[PDB]
Amino acid sequence: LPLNPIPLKDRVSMIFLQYGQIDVIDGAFVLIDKTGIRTHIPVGSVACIMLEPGTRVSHAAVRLAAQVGTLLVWVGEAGVRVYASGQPGGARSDKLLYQAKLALDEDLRLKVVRKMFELRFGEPAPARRSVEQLRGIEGSRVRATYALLAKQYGVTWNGRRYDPKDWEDTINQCISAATSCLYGVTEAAILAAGYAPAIGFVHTGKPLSFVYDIADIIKFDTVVPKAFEIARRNPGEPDREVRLACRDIFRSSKTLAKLIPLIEDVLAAGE
Amino acid sequence: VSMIFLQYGQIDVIDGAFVLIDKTGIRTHIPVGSVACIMLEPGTRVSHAAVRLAAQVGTLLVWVGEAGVRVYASGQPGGARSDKLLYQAKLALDEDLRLKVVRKMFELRFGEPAPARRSVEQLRGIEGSRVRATYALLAKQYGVTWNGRRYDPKDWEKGDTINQCISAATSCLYGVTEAAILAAGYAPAIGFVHTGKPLSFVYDIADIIKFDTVVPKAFEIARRNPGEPDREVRLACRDIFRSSKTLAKLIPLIEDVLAAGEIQPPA
Amino acid sequence: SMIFLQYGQIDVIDGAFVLIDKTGIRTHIPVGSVACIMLEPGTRVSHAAVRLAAQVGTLLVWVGEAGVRVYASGQPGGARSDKLLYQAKLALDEDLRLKVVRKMFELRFGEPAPARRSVEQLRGIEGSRVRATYALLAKQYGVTWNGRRYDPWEKGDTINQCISAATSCLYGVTEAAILAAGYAPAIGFVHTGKPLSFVYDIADIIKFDTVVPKAFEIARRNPGEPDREVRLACRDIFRSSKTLAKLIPLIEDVLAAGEIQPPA
Amino acid sequence: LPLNPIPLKDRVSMIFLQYGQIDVIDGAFVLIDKTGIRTHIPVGSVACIMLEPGTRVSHAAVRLAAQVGTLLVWVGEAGVRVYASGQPGGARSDKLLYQAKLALDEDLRLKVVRKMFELRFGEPAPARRSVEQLRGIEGSRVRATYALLAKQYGVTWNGRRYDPKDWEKGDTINQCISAATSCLYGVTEAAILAAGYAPAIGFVHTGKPLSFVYDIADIIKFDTVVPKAFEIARRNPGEPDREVRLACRDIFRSSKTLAKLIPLIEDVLAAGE
């Protein structure tokens, strides 16, 4: 009797696990505490499981997670992604070769970049502009957008600073955790649909370029403003508030349901 | 491209190095620069610090079966290096480069180079004929009753012992082959002869060394006819992959097959 | 006429309602010998019995002991529309409603009401007389009186508990009487709005005559679980005084004083 | 705990009980078979419970069913209503006095009758027609509708015969119609009682103990209930009662009659102004 993954839209967004060993008991994903408190995890119903520091995963656990099509993501402090294990062959050859074909030809690559721009800012990109120019426009627009959300939500803002060194400043932590959730479910979606997260168009060079493209498209529409809202209240547990808030945002926005057709419509530029 | 197989222990980090603690207490300190790929066999427990270290130094982690008989999971999923994926994909999209890679696969599988006149489909037919004759010839060499390759895909227990041994053997071979394709940094779905399937490249590279050892071993196990032929063939392929170092010899074969496309490698 | 049946199964034998008891004492009942059958706890009704009561038009009312409570009743919502429209016409017309209220006052208190008094004025007179009656009974039975104070159970005064239980029983028998006569318990004249207003009226007519002085009689003592003692005392008073039988002519006279042609 | 009743729309249509004794076990409405098979029944979650011959309900059972606002309907052949039991004071004084006020005045009564005619047939009634004349027109339209459905489904028709007393040897069509319309009269009576009105105070039908039920149910009877009975009668099955109860259940679920009954009552009485 086989065991196959369920579609992504029918799953929950994410599950954060910490401080405990992850075993397989009777064929189930189980999180055992140091005190012995067993906690079953419906791995087949989650899009991705974030493994915080303190989690000792077993071989059967990674096997089971991969078999039911649930991405494992080792994360560090503030939920920043450290590593990930998934299906060693979840990519469909037609979609993977299509994505790669669009990535190799620079014409279709420019078409996909401009399509990403138009889908991001709701207006067509300026004509006769190169990929670098559109990326610089993206930088200025994102900077001014962070500033505008800052003035609207009444949060002290000075810059992005994604490095946790200069934090010491809870807004950057909230944005990093929120965008970390979005990157987790986005990488999970890209793996599920059959595409390559490393083959990208805008954020080329980075190992998760396509994840950064797709997620950067819908970042400020849903996830970042909620991070500013969590940051304004200044709670004692910013990570938990950002995770719960992102969970509600993904639920109400149907993010998991819209991620794959977003990718298809993005790559649909090169007919 | 170096790698190591860990088994029956817990992988922690001590003094900034991978350590494999055994059931008996035998620590195996592994420097970060000494291995580029860690195969995790059954019975291993991975700690968070180890995954963080392997991530920061770029070490590939592949949860596999014993001796890479099955590839269950792999870190950096979907492909890590994009230049190698676009290299393989570029080789597979252009018909000239595709035909070149296919011809190199043929020349490596059978010692004789293929006829130059033929296209990919004609080479596929030649492959089919040679595989038919090889099935018959092995059937006579080991003295097993052979009625063909046909099996029942719905129920496993409805096929011949020889078809079970061949199918299990090719399963293990797809295991090590997939391990080599992942360790080399290429996509298993981007195939040349086989296309459309998510493991087409695994079938391509695995068809090259298939009838060299593992299939004859399947005919041997079928000749002995044990009670559990699937387990005997799987353990036999395990021992073949360990003793002959098949996984180590597969990666240069991949790089050479793709290298015959006459396009500069990523490197 | 009506009969109370308890502790046995009701079936049909050769065309008659038979009550079968654990002792084997059959109780045969012709189809026309009862206009209503009060079913006390412990009665199981066979389908043929309900079918016969339907064929002859007999009302079945599932009640408590001596009608202390009214749980259900056959012909739900009333089977006679003539009496319903009679009570309703008595209630909608201001003149007739006032006449009925005055009749309630004259049959409750031994003297007729002051003339040219409205329903709200007679209501105030009623409240004052009720208060004087509460104080008088408190002095007569030696019960410490603080008022009609109750928190909407056990965490409260005992006298108001006994009064609440007693009035509950009286609303029971009064409801059974109103149902037996063929009228709606919701159509009231003094009380208006609640689904048991008429019950509160007819019960208010005879409330302080027997059941409330008995509630103060049990409050004079200090027994465990006063609810059960008051319920049983009210039961024995309803059986001994035949309150359910005497309440129907009281209703027919209260409604009759509206000077309307009553239904036969 | 008071256990207050459930709204009627949330309930299930109907449940038929054929044999065994009905008891209350630990506060539960249980049907005990003669073999000892106990069958608990969600009395609180069903609009009306039908009691076929062979059932022997207890006092606590009628008390419980009445307390949870579930009408008990004793039925006979083809489920024709024989008796009923419900709450002793489950009627709302305001709605009952409104229905009574409409019934007392001749003008308001005629208004409600004209509203019933306009909601039953697809055209308003002629003006300045008395109640008797409109009742005759209703009779002719109903007879022609029976004949029309009989000719549509191809059933040997002789005329509507309400009571099973007048049934002949092989009259199955009137059996199906009687069972179906009996179910409709059951849920309609449960809705009238639940809403707080009197089932005996009618406007078109008068003098019968269920006049208002026959009015409100006669308004929406032929829209869906009767032609399905003609279909089942055309099939002529072995168990017509169970088939008719199935089809009536699916019609009450599809048309959502149990939820629409009370708005139909208030919209019919609303014409009295």
Next chain:
Amino acid sequence: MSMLVVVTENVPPRLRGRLAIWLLEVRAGVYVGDVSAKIREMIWEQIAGLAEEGNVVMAWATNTETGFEFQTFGLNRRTPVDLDGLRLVSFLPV
């Protein structure tokens, strides 16, 4: 109208009958029905008032991420836990 499941453990029979009034006891102590929000709240009033010494957990269909929510009454070896908003069940060891 949402789906409702009430699974009880070590409760007096009064609560089992009361739950049998509105719900369907498909297994020993497992009740299934379809009720509205107010009816669900009333049923929970019954549960909290009548359990006294047993553990009863009730789940109902909603529009949350998991599609349903649940709450407990009384102590049990299977205790709910909150994971950044997503409520799961942990098994306390002996």
Next chain:
Amino acid sequence: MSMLVVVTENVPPRLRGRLAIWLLEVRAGVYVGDVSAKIREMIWEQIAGLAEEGNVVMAWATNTETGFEFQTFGLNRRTPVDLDGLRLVSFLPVG
């Protein structure tokens, strides 16, 4: 997205873990979830293929007049009965 509940009795631990893969085990043998039609059918394939010795019941929300439906695998003292289309549960005596 319909709500699902699965009550297992005397099943091997394989089926219990397999049900724990997708559904939440709120009580011993009582699993709750929210799945689609196909996922529910697959879960029923797991049950019918792994129950082997025990009795399982599966109920899910639908558009029926009761609001839900249910089917069983195996034998139990509580047997579904059909009352004119309304399926209830009867309690069989000893024997």
Next chain:
DNA sequence: GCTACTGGGGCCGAGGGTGTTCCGAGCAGTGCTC
């Protein structure tokens, strides 16, 4: 029924040519009672 314990055994359930079809009242002596 379920649950805990505790050695013994196995590392295991596969097979691949391709895409296309708020308000009245009283009445006692400002509060009670309806």
Next chain:
DNA sequence: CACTGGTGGTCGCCGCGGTTGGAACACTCTAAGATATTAGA
């Protein structure tokens, strides 16, 4: 922890101003060899 059995004890759980997408099939090709169709990719 759910079900069963027998016997003593109760008939009860209340109050009452009115109103405001997946599989069926359709195919390429080749070398053996039923020199047609078939087994293998």
Next chain:
DNA sequence: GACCACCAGTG
């Protein structure tokens, strides 16, 4: 007569 509360015994 119907129904509940109590208190173990067994699987």
Next chain:
DNA sequence: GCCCCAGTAGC
């Protein structure tokens, strides 16, 4: 070293 399987009481 991880995990399933079988029997074996115990409540």
